[PDB]
Amino acid sequence: KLIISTNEHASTDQGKTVSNGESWNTGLSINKGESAYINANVRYYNTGTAPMYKVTPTTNLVLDGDTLSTIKAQENQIGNNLSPGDTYPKKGLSPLALNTMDQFSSRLIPINYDQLKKLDAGKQIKLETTQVSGNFGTKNSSGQIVTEGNSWSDYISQIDSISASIILDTENESYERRVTAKNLQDPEDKTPELTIGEAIEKAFGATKKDGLLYFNDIPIDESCVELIFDDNTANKIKDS
Amino acid sequence: KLIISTNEHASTDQGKTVSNGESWNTGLSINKGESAYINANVRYYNTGTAPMYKVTPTTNLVLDGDTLSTIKAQENQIGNNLSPGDTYPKKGLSPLALNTMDQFSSRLIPINYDQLKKLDAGKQIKLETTQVSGNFGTKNSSGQIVTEGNSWSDYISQIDSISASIILDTENESYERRVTAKNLQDPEDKTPELTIGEAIEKAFGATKKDGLLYFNDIPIDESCVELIFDDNTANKIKDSLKTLSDKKIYNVKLERGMNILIKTPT
């Protein structure tokens, strides 16, 4: 959801002069620069295989074709824990409000008069996430778990460059996985070779019944599901 | 309770002209972007088995279906100590006031004019907590207690994923516990097996009298209390009952993800 708070001053003054005399006056002052404020109710989710600690996403706000602002999550909108398949705030709670713009959460998000006019004319606003930063837990010299100073951004680029992405889209749920591939040009890349069937079996933990993979009870065999590729994957599959 | 501070100006002017006359005036201007400020009186509580140091909860404020704001606890609203069964502020004191939004507690919580005009029309605001941050105490190389840099958030997810939840809800008091379960798929999971009866005995420290568990004096046996499960636990427990000799709920093997809730009779 999105909430608009129109920023104008409204004054009503009345007098009584004494012959005789009375008066009434009204006013309406509006600032053309910062004419309204926007509050967005958001909600995070995880579809991977590992949790993310200290979730600090970055989002965009697009009215028509214009990015109104990009805001990184402050201390008020940081998710301490996010397990796979979970959601912050957890199911049954209410979405969190992203309504501050500066680093210390002491400044609201303004919009223009020509933007507020479109917003109240029957036009919607859109949200998209550019990036998300978090942490991961490891063990220090003792038996404790330390999750400070362990950024996922150090491994995102290194993982996306040597892996293929597979997204199983069941109903009311979604899964996304990365499976390590092998380079044939490099003779010193000793990564084990896999086919698409073995990749699907390993990524989602499917078990063969009669040689056909089943996820839990539904079938995911290539003749029982709809596969969607992009142009590059389709070209690399047709020739093979 | 919640407190509203309506934000408008109010000017009264009068003159005396000399021909002879007088004058009067009275005005009131309000801002329709930040028309009021809200103040919330909160009070923490603990129902676990371990204390939390430097309690820094995060709360939500919803008016009708709209989350007004989410505020993390500042230095003014941090509780240094919270033992199990206690509150902050302790019993006999007054609730603490949460009335600042920014990080340094120098900016109040505003609401809209369309939100104030609805609040004063006979509508209430609701508060729900989304997360809590705290610390735990360990011993360093000398023999002192260090509670800085020891976050519970590192163990919340690792504990919730291998445990079942048991909530004993007696009168004027509530308890919540986590008991470690066992995965039968993994052959290298050497966690001891447990039934629901043993889990209830261990979690709440109940002692058997004649084979029936008693908490302190009130019975907590499966026939003397009301058990409430969710759909998943109910389905997972209705199929293991048939393949049993005693057909007792307390004799079912404990598994990860259960949500057993125990309620004692009035």
Short mmCIF file of C-alpha atoms in Angstrom, two decimals:
data_model
loop_
_atom_site.label_atom_id
_atom_site.label_comp_id
_atom_site.label_asym_id
_atom_site.label_seq_id
_atom_site.Cartn_x
_atom_site.Cartn_y
_atom_site.Cartn_z
CA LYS A 1 0.00 0.00 0.00
CA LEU A 2 0.94 3.66 -0.44
CA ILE A 3 -0.24 6.61 1.66
CA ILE A 4 -0.22 10.27 0.57
CA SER A 5 -0.21 13.18 3.03
CA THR A 6 -0.96 16.47 1.28
CA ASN A 7 1.14 19.31 2.73
CA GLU A 8 -0.86 22.55 2.84
CA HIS A 9 -1.74 25.16 5.45
CA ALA A 10 -5.40 25.98 6.14
CA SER A 11 -6.31 29.03 8.23
CA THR A 12 -9.70 30.41 9.29
CA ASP A 13 -9.84 33.88 10.87
CA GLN A 14 -12.90 35.82 12.04
CA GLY A 15 -13.27 39.28 13.53
CA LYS A 16 -15.83 41.62 15.06
CA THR A 17 -15.44 45.39 14.63
CA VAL A 18 -17.40 48.01 16.56
CA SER A 19 -21.09 51.38 14.30
CA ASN A 20 -20.73 47.62 13.86
CA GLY A 21 -18.97 45.08 11.66
CA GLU A 22 -18.00 41.42 11.27
CA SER A 23 -15.65 39.51 9.00
CA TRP A 24 -14.68 35.98 7.97
CA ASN A 25 -11.55 34.85 6.13
CA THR A 26 -10.09 31.55 4.93
CA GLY A 27 -6.71 30.64 3.50
CA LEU A 28 -4.95 27.86 1.62
CA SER A 29 -1.16 27.90 1.20
CA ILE A 30 0.51 25.12 -0.80
CA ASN A 31 4.21 24.57 -1.50
CA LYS A 32 4.89 23.68 -5.13
CA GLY A 33 8.23 22.05 -4.29
CA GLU A 34 7.25 19.60 -1.54
CA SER A 35 3.48 19.34 -1.90
CA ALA A 36 2.96 15.88 -0.36
CA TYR A 37 4.63 12.96 1.40
CA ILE A 38 4.48 9.28 0.48
CA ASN A 39 4.51 6.31 2.87
CA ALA A 40 4.97 2.81 1.46
CA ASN A 41 4.03 -0.46 3.19
CA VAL A 42 6.52 -3.13 2.10
CA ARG A 43 7.22 -6.75 3.06
CA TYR A 44 10.31 -8.88 2.48
CA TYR A 45 10.55 -12.53 1.48
CA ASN A 46 13.23 -15.18 0.95
CA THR A 47 13.29 -17.91 -1.69
CA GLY A 48 16.89 -19.14 -1.42
CA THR A 49 18.61 -21.87 0.57
CA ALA A 50 20.28 -19.80 3.31
CA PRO A 51 19.06 -17.12 5.73
CA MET A 52 20.03 -13.46 5.60
CA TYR A 53 20.85 -11.53 8.77
CA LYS A 54 20.49 -7.74 8.94
CA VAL A 55 18.48 -7.44 5.73
CA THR A 56 18.98 -3.94 4.29
CA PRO A 57 17.26 -3.73 0.89
CA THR A 58 17.37 -0.81 -1.53
CA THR A 59 14.21 0.09 -3.46
CA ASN A 60 13.07 2.46 -6.21
CA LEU A 61 9.84 4.43 -6.58
CA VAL A 62 8.60 4.98 -10.15
CA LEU A 63 5.51 7.10 -10.81
CA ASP A 64 5.23 7.14 -14.62
CA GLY A 65 8.74 6.75 -16.05
CA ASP A 66 10.53 8.80 -13.42
CA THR A 67 12.37 7.34 -10.43
CA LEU A 68 11.14 9.47 -7.53
CA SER A 69 13.83 8.32 -5.09
CA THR A 70 16.02 5.39 -4.08
CA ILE A 71 16.06 4.66 -0.35
CA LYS A 72 18.30 2.24 1.53
CA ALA A 73 16.78 0.62 4.60
CA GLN A 74 17.38 2.54 7.82
CA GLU A 75 17.59 1.10 11.34
CA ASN A 76 13.79 1.13 11.57
CA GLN A 77 13.39 -1.09 8.48
CA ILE A 78 16.16 -3.65 9.00
CA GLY A 79 15.17 -7.30 9.27
CA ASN A 80 17.21 -9.12 11.89
CA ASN A 81 16.29 -12.62 10.67
CA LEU A 82 14.92 -14.01 7.41
CA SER A 83 14.84 -17.78 6.99
CA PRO A 84 14.17 -19.47 3.63
CA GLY A 85 10.46 -19.56 2.91
CA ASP A 86 9.82 -17.02 5.68
CA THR A 87 8.81 -13.36 5.47
CA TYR A 88 9.60 -10.20 7.44
CA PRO A 89 7.35 -9.19 9.15
CA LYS A 90 6.21 -12.79 9.70
CA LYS A 91 2.89 -14.02 8.35
CA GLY A 92 0.03 -12.75 10.49
CA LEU A 93 1.68 -9.40 11.23
CA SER A 94 1.35 -6.14 9.29
CA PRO A 95 3.68 -4.68 6.64
CA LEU A 96 6.37 -2.27 7.78
CA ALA A 97 6.22 1.40 6.79
CA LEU A 98 9.06 2.90 4.75
CA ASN A 99 8.43 6.62 5.21
CA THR A 100 11.86 8.18 5.87
CA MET A 101 14.52 9.20 3.38
CA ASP A 102 17.69 10.39 5.12
CA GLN A 103 20.25 8.26 6.94
CA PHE A 104 18.96 8.96 10.46
CA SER A 105 15.21 8.71 9.72
CA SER A 106 14.45 12.39 10.32
CA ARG A 107 13.22 13.52 6.89
CA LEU A 108 10.16 12.45 4.93
CA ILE A 109 9.89 11.57 1.23
CA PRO A 110 8.56 14.54 -0.80
CA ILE A 111 6.89 14.61 -4.20
CA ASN A 112 6.22 17.38 -6.70
CA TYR A 113 2.97 19.21 -7.40
CA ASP A 114 3.03 17.90 -10.97
CA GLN A 115 3.61 14.43 -9.49
CA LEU A 116 0.88 14.67 -6.85
CA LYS A 117 -1.55 15.86 -9.52
CA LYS A 118 -0.87 12.71 -11.55
CA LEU A 119 -1.03 10.58 -8.40
CA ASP A 120 -4.52 11.88 -7.57
CA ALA A 121 -5.65 11.63 -11.22
CA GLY A 122 -5.76 7.82 -11.27
CA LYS A 123 -2.11 6.84 -11.62
CA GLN A 124 -0.30 4.28 -9.48
CA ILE A 125 3.25 4.15 -8.13
CA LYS A 126 5.57 1.18 -8.54
CA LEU A 127 8.31 -0.34 -6.40
CA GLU A 128 11.32 -2.42 -7.44
CA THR A 129 14.37 -3.61 -5.53
CA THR A 130 17.76 -2.76 -7.01
CA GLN A 131 19.87 -4.67 -4.46
CA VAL A 132 19.80 -6.27 -1.02
CA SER A 133 22.67 -6.42 1.49
CA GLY A 134 22.91 -8.78 4.44
CA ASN A 135 25.18 -11.03 6.50
CA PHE A 136 25.91 -14.71 7.08
CA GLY A 137 26.89 -16.64 10.19
CA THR A 138 30.22 -18.36 10.79
CA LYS A 139 32.05 -19.76 13.82
CA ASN A 140 34.86 -17.81 15.46
CA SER A 141 37.76 -19.22 17.49
CA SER A 142 35.21 -20.24 20.14
CA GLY A 143 31.90 -22.04 19.73
CA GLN A 144 30.08 -18.74 19.17
CA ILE A 145 28.44 -17.55 15.95
CA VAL A 146 29.64 -14.24 14.49
CA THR A 147 27.56 -12.56 11.78
CA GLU A 148 29.16 -9.09 11.79
CA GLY A 149 31.55 -8.26 8.96
CA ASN A 150 30.44 -11.24 6.83
CA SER A 151 28.80 -9.67 3.78
CA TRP A 152 27.00 -11.58 1.03
CA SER A 153 28.03 -8.91 -1.50
CA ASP A 154 31.55 -10.35 -1.51
CA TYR A 155 30.20 -13.66 -2.85
CA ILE A 156 27.21 -12.60 -4.99
CA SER A 157 29.32 -11.78 -8.06
CA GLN A 158 31.63 -14.77 -7.58
CA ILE A 159 28.66 -17.15 -7.33
CA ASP A 160 26.60 -15.72 -10.20
CA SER A 161 29.55 -16.06 -12.60
CA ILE A 162 30.14 -19.83 -12.35
CA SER A 163 26.58 -21.06 -11.86
CA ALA A 164 23.32 -21.53 -13.73
CA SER A 165 20.02 -20.35 -12.26
CA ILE A 166 16.98 -22.64 -12.05
CA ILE A 167 13.61 -21.37 -10.80
CA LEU A 168 10.91 -23.90 -9.92
CA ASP A 169 7.57 -22.07 -9.77
CA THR A 170 5.00 -24.23 -8.01
CA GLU A 171 1.67 -22.87 -6.80
CA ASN A 172 1.53 -20.46 -3.82
CA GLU A 173 5.32 -20.92 -3.50
CA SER A 174 8.50 -20.22 -5.47
CA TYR A 175 12.07 -21.53 -5.38
CA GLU A 176 15.29 -20.19 -6.92
CA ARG A 177 18.60 -22.07 -6.92
CA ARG A 178 22.13 -21.80 -8.29
CA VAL A 179 23.94 -24.93 -9.50
CA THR A 180 27.65 -24.91 -10.30
CA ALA A 181 28.48 -25.43 -13.97
CA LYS A 182 31.71 -26.50 -15.67
CA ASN A 183 33.85 -24.65 -18.20
CA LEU A 184 35.05 -26.82 -21.07
CA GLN A 185 37.50 -24.27 -22.49
CA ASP A 186 39.61 -24.34 -19.31
CA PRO A 187 41.42 -27.69 -18.95
CA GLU A 188 42.13 -27.03 -15.25
CA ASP A 189 38.46 -26.62 -14.26
CA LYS A 190 37.83 -29.96 -12.54
CA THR A 191 34.23 -29.19 -11.54
CA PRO A 192 32.03 -32.29 -11.95
CA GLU A 193 29.88 -32.34 -15.08
CA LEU A 194 26.10 -32.49 -14.74
CA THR A 195 23.07 -32.64 -17.02
CA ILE A 196 19.91 -30.60 -16.59
CA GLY A 197 18.13 -33.58 -15.04
CA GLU A 198 20.78 -34.05 -12.38
CA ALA A 199 20.87 -30.30 -11.75
CA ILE A 200 17.11 -30.27 -11.16
CA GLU A 201 17.39 -33.35 -8.95
CA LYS A 202 20.15 -31.82 -6.82
CA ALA A 203 18.85 -28.25 -6.58
CA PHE A 204 15.36 -29.06 -5.28
CA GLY A 205 16.02 -32.40 -3.55
CA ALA A 206 13.75 -34.43 -5.82
CA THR A 207 13.73 -38.23 -5.61
CA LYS A 208 13.33 -40.56 -8.58
CA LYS A 209 10.32 -42.88 -8.44
CA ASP A 210 10.53 -44.88 -11.69
CA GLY A 211 13.27 -42.80 -13.27
CA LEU A 212 11.06 -39.68 -13.21
CA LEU A 213 11.69 -36.92 -10.68
CA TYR A 214 9.02 -35.95 -8.15
CA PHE A 215 9.32 -32.88 -5.93
CA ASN A 216 7.08 -33.97 -3.06
CA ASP A 217 4.21 -35.70 -4.87
CA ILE A 218 3.76 -33.60 -8.05
CA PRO A 219 5.82 -34.54 -11.15
CA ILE A 220 8.55 -32.27 -12.49
CA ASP A 221 9.54 -34.39 -15.49
CA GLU A 222 10.12 -32.42 -18.69
CA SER A 223 6.93 -33.82 -20.26
CA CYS A 224 4.80 -32.88 -17.22
CA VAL A 225 5.98 -29.27 -16.69
CA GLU A 226 6.38 -26.17 -18.85
CA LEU A 227 10.00 -25.07 -19.29
CA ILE A 228 10.68 -21.42 -20.11
CA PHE A 229 14.10 -20.20 -21.28
CA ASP A 230 15.50 -16.97 -22.67
CA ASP A 231 16.96 -16.51 -26.15
CA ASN A 232 20.49 -17.52 -25.13
CA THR A 233 19.44 -20.71 -23.34
CA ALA A 234 17.09 -21.66 -26.18
CA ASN A 235 19.87 -21.21 -28.74
CA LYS A 236 22.36 -23.20 -26.63
CA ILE A 237 19.79 -25.98 -26.16
CA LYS A 238 18.52 -26.28 -29.74
CA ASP A 239 21.97 -26.96 -31.20
CA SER A 240 22.84 -29.46 -28.47
CA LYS B 1 -2.63 3.74 26.23
CA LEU B 2 -2.09 6.28 23.44
CA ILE B 3 -1.94 10.08 23.66
CA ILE B 4 -2.74 12.63 20.94
CA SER B 5 -1.32 16.16 20.75
CA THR B 6 -3.23 18.20 18.17
CA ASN B 7 -0.94 20.58 16.27
CA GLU B 8 -2.47 23.97 15.42
CA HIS B 9 -1.86 27.62 16.17
CA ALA B 10 -4.33 29.91 17.93
CA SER B 11 -3.94 33.69 17.77
CA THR B 12 -6.14 36.33 19.43
CA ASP B 13 -5.66 40.01 18.59
CA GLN B 14 -7.37 43.24 19.61
CA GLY B 15 -6.86 46.91 18.81
CA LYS B 16 -8.10 50.36 19.77
CA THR B 17 -8.35 53.02 17.04
CA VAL B 18 -8.88 56.73 17.64
CA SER B 19 -13.30 59.29 15.16
CA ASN B 20 -13.42 56.39 17.62
CA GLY B 21 -13.45 52.62 17.27
CA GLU B 22 -12.12 49.24 18.33
CA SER B 23 -11.37 45.85 16.79
CA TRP B 24 -11.18 42.13 17.49
CA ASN B 25 -9.75 39.05 15.80
CA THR B 26 -9.31 35.32 16.40
CA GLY B 27 -7.77 32.74 14.08
CA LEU B 28 -6.63 29.13 14.00
CA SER B 29 -4.31 27.64 11.37
CA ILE B 30 -3.49 23.94 11.09
CA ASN B 31 -1.08 21.95 8.93
CA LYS B 32 -2.68 19.13 6.97
CA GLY B 33 0.56 17.16 6.58
CA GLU B 34 1.50 16.82 10.26
CA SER B 35 -1.69 17.64 12.15
CA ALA B 36 -0.88 15.83 15.41
CA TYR B 37 1.65 13.77 17.35
CA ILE B 38 1.08 10.34 18.91
CA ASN B 39 2.53 9.02 22.17
CA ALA B 40 2.48 5.33 23.10
CA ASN B 41 2.82 3.87 26.60
CA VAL B 42 4.41 0.44 26.23
CA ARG B 43 5.70 -2.20 28.65
CA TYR B 44 7.89 -5.19 27.83
CA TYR B 45 7.66 -8.72 29.21
CA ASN B 46 9.61 -11.98 29.06
CA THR B 47 8.19 -15.52 28.95
CA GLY B 48 11.34 -17.49 28.08
CA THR B 49 13.99 -19.27 30.12
CA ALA B 50 16.87 -16.80 29.69
CA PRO B 51 17.23 -13.05 30.28
CA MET B 52 17.72 -10.41 27.61
CA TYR B 53 20.22 -7.58 28.03
CA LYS B 54 19.84 -4.30 26.12
CA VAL B 55 16.29 -5.00 24.96
CA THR B 56 15.66 -3.02 21.75
CA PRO B 57 12.27 -4.02 20.31
CA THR B 58 10.76 -2.87 17.03
CA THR B 59 7.04 -2.10 16.93
CA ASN B 60 4.34 -1.29 14.36
CA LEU B 61 1.47 1.19 14.62
CA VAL B 62 -1.63 0.46 12.51
CA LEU B 63 -4.73 2.67 12.48
CA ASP B 64 -7.21 0.81 10.26
CA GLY B 65 -5.16 -1.29 7.85
CA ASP B 66 -2.33 1.18 7.37
CA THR B 67 1.00 0.89 9.19
CA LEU B 68 1.62 4.43 10.42
CA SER B 69 5.29 3.87 11.27
CA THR B 70 7.81 1.31 12.51
CA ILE B 71 10.08 2.54 15.30
CA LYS B 72 13.16 0.83 16.72
CA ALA B 73 13.87 1.49 20.38
CA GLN B 74 16.17 4.44 21.03
CA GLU B 75 18.47 4.95 24.01
CA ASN B 76 15.51 6.31 26.00
CA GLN B 77 13.48 3.09 25.58
CA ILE B 78 16.17 0.42 26.03
CA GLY B 79 15.83 -2.00 28.93
CA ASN B 80 19.15 -3.07 30.39
CA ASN B 81 17.77 -6.10 32.26
CA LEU B 82 14.79 -8.37 31.62
CA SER B 83 14.67 -11.60 33.61
CA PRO B 84 12.10 -14.33 32.87
CA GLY B 85 8.75 -13.56 34.47
CA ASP B 86 9.62 -9.87 34.92
CA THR B 87 8.67 -6.76 32.95
CA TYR B 88 10.27 -3.45 32.08
CA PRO B 89 9.48 -1.17 33.84
CA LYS B 90 9.03 -3.59 36.76
CA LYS B 91 5.66 -4.22 38.37
CA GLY B 92 4.60 -1.22 40.43
CA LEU B 93 6.18 1.37 38.13
CA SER B 94 4.60 3.22 35.20
CA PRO B 95 4.80 2.31 31.50
CA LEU B 96 7.51 3.96 29.42
CA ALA B 97 6.67 6.48 26.71
CA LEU B 98 7.60 5.86 23.07
CA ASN B 99 7.21 9.23 21.37
CA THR B 100 10.21 9.69 19.04
CA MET B 101 10.87 8.40 15.53
CA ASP B 102 14.42 9.36 14.53
CA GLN B 103 17.63 7.72 15.72
CA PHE B 104 18.65 10.47 18.16
CA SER B 105 15.20 11.06 19.75
CA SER B 106 14.74 14.60 18.43
CA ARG B 107 11.74 14.24 16.11
CA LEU B 108 8.17 13.36 17.06
CA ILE B 109 5.78 10.91 15.38
CA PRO B 110 3.34 12.73 13.06
CA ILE B 111 -0.02 11.62 11.71
CA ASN B 112 -2.13 12.82 8.79
CA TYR B 113 -5.21 15.02 8.95
CA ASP B 114 -7.26 12.19 7.45
CA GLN B 115 -5.79 9.98 10.19
CA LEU B 116 -6.53 12.35 13.08
CA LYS B 117 -10.05 13.00 11.80
CA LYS B 118 -10.56 9.22 11.90
CA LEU B 119 -8.87 8.74 15.29
CA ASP B 120 -11.20 11.29 16.87
CA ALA B 121 -14.26 9.68 15.23
CA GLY B 122 -14.14 6.62 17.51
CA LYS B 123 -11.30 4.51 16.14
CA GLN B 124 -8.39 2.93 18.00
CA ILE B 125 -4.75 2.39 17.12
CA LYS B 126 -3.10 -1.03 17.40
CA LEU B 127 0.49 -1.95 18.27
CA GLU B 128 2.32 -5.15 17.36
CA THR B 129 5.99 -6.02 17.78
CA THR B 130 7.85 -7.42 14.78
CA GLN B 131 11.27 -8.22 16.26
CA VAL B 132 13.38 -7.76 19.39
CA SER B 133 17.17 -7.36 19.65
CA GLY B 134 19.14 -8.22 22.76
CA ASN B 135 22.29 -9.71 24.22
CA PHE B 136 23.44 -12.63 26.34
CA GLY B 137 26.21 -12.94 28.92
CA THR B 138 29.34 -15.07 28.60
CA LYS B 139 32.64 -15.33 30.46
CA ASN B 140 35.85 -13.90 29.00
CA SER B 141 39.45 -14.99 29.63
CA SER B 142 39.61 -13.30 33.05
CA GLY B 143 36.36 -14.43 34.67
CA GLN B 144 34.06 -11.47 34.08
CA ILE B 145 30.71 -11.31 32.28
CA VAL B 146 30.72 -9.70 28.83
CA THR B 147 27.37 -9.00 27.13
CA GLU B 148 28.53 -6.71 24.30
CA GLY B 149 28.76 -8.21 20.84
CA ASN B 150 26.72 -11.30 21.80
CA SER B 151 23.52 -11.04 19.77
CA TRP B 152 20.53 -13.36 20.05
CA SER B 153 19.71 -12.75 16.38
CA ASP B 154 22.58 -15.07 15.45
CA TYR B 155 20.86 -17.96 17.27
CA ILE B 156 17.16 -17.20 16.70
CA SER B 157 17.00 -18.83 13.27
CA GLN B 158 19.39 -21.66 14.14
CA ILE B 159 17.19 -22.55 17.13
CA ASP B 160 13.75 -22.13 15.54
CA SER B 161 14.68 -24.55 12.74
CA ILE B 162 15.51 -27.64 14.84
CA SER B 163 12.99 -27.26 17.65
CA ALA B 164 9.28 -27.53 18.43
CA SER B 165 7.27 -24.90 20.29
CA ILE B 166 5.38 -25.70 23.50
CA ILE B 167 3.27 -22.99 25.15
CA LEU B 168 1.74 -23.72 28.56
CA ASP B 169 -0.88 -21.06 29.24
CA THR B 170 -1.88 -21.14 32.90
CA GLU B 171 -3.84 -18.38 34.61
CA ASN B 172 -2.26 -14.91 35.09
CA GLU B 173 0.96 -16.38 33.64
CA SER B 174 2.25 -17.80 30.36
CA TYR B 175 5.27 -19.89 29.37
CA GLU B 176 6.88 -20.60 25.99
CA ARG B 177 9.58 -23.20 25.38
CA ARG B 178 11.62 -24.77 22.58
CA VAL B 179 12.53 -28.47 22.69
CA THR B 180 15.05 -29.99 20.29
CA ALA B 181 13.57 -32.51 17.85
CA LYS B 182 15.19 -35.19 15.68
CA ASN B 183 15.25 -35.61 11.90
CA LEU B 184 14.60 -39.21 10.86
CA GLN B 185 15.72 -38.58 7.27
CA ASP B 186 19.31 -37.74 8.23
CA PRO B 187 21.16 -40.86 9.48
CA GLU B 188 23.85 -38.68 11.10
CA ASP B 189 21.41 -36.76 13.34
CA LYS B 190 22.16 -38.30 16.74
CA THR B 191 19.73 -36.10 18.68
CA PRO B 192 17.88 -38.24 21.26
CA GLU B 193 14.31 -39.19 20.43
CA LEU B 194 11.50 -37.77 22.56
CA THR B 195 7.74 -38.10 22.86
CA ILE B 196 5.37 -35.25 23.64
CA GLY B 197 5.03 -36.35 27.26
CA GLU B 198 8.79 -36.23 27.83
CA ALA B 199 8.99 -32.91 25.99
CA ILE B 200 6.33 -31.41 28.26
CA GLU B 201 8.04 -32.87 31.33
CA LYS B 202 11.45 -31.47 30.37
CA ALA B 203 10.37 -28.05 29.08
CA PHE B 204 8.29 -26.98 32.09
CA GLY B 205 10.03 -28.95 34.85
CA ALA B 206 7.01 -31.06 35.78
CA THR B 207 7.35 -34.00 38.17
CA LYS B 208 5.38 -37.23 37.90
CA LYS B 209 3.16 -38.22 40.84
CA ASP B 210 1.58 -41.52 39.71
CA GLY B 211 2.61 -41.47 36.06
CA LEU B 212 0.74 -38.17 35.54
CA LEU B 213 2.63 -34.90 35.12
CA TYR B 214 1.94 -32.07 37.57
CA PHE B 215 3.33 -28.58 36.98
CA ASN B 216 3.25 -27.44 40.60
CA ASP B 217 -0.13 -28.73 41.80
CA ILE B 218 -2.46 -28.28 38.78
CA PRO B 219 -2.63 -31.35 36.50
CA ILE B 220 -1.22 -31.01 32.99
CA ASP B 221 -2.09 -34.52 31.78
CA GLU B 222 -3.52 -34.73 28.27
CA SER B 223 -7.01 -35.43 29.64
CA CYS B 224 -6.96 -32.70 32.32
CA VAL B 225 -5.99 -29.88 29.90
CA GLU B 226 -6.98 -28.64 26.45
CA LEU B 227 -4.43 -29.04 23.65
CA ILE B 228 -4.58 -26.72 20.63
CA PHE B 229 -2.58 -27.34 17.45
CA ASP B 230 -2.46 -25.73 14.04
CA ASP B 231 -3.46 -27.52 10.84
CA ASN B 232 0.03 -28.86 10.11
CA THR B 233 0.60 -30.32 13.57
CA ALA B 234 -2.94 -31.71 13.70
CA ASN B 235 -2.44 -33.51 10.38
CA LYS B 236 1.01 -34.74 11.47
CA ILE B 237 -0.43 -36.07 14.74
CA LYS B 238 -3.70 -37.60 13.49
CA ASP B 239 -1.84 -40.21 11.41
CA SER B 240 0.63 -41.38 14.08
CA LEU B 241 -2.18 -42.04 16.57
CA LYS B 242 -3.70 -44.94 14.62
CA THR B 243 -0.36 -46.81 14.51
CA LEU B 244 -0.03 -46.99 18.29
CA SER B 245 -0.95 -49.39 21.07
CA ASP B 246 -2.09 -46.89 23.72
CA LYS B 247 -3.45 -44.26 21.28
CA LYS B 248 -2.25 -41.47 23.58
CA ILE B 249 -1.36 -37.98 22.35
CA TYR B 250 1.54 -37.81 24.82
CA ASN B 251 3.03 -41.00 23.32
CA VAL B 252 3.54 -39.52 19.84
CA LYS B 253 7.10 -38.83 18.70
CA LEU B 254 8.13 -35.18 18.66
CA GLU B 255 9.08 -33.67 15.30
CA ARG B 256 10.33 -30.29 14.13
CA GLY B 257 7.71 -27.63 13.48
CA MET B 258 5.08 -28.56 16.07
CA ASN B 259 3.03 -25.80 17.70
CA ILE B 260 1.45 -27.48 20.73
CA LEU B 261 -0.38 -25.05 23.04
CA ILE B 262 -1.58 -26.21 26.47
CA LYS B 263 -4.46 -24.51 28.28
CA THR B 264 -5.43 -25.34 31.85
CA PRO B 265 -9.09 -25.40 32.95
CA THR B 266 -10.65 -22.39 34.65
#
